[PDB]
Amino acid sequence: SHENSNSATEGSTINYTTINYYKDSYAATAGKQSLKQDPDKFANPVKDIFTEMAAPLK
């Protein structure tokens, strides 16, 4: 379509498939989000990574 880029997610590393009937994109449906995850950001934010087989503190 030919609307404005009003949505709160314009420039998000994940892309959506939404529906809209208005010139402003924030009026659009929530749609579908891509299913990417990065748990290491929270669960394993160590500088020097350690493998599963080794002893963590060597």
Q: Least distance to another protein from the beta carbon of 2, Å?
A: 14
* 4 three-state secondary structure: strand
What is the DSSP-derived secondary structure letter of residue 9?
T
Q: Is 4 in the site for another protein (CB under 8 A)?
A: yes
Q: Is 29 in the site for another protein (CB under 8 A)?
A: yes
Q: Least distance to a copy of itself from the beta carbon of 23, Å?
A: 6
Member of 15, 23, 33, 50 binding a copy of itself (CB under 8 A): 23
Please state the φ and ψ torsions of residue 20, each to the nearest 5 degrees.
-160, 150
Residues 6+ apart with CB under 8 A from 30: 16, 18
The residue ranges that bind a copy of itself (CB under 8 A) are: 2, 4, 17, 23, 29, 31-32
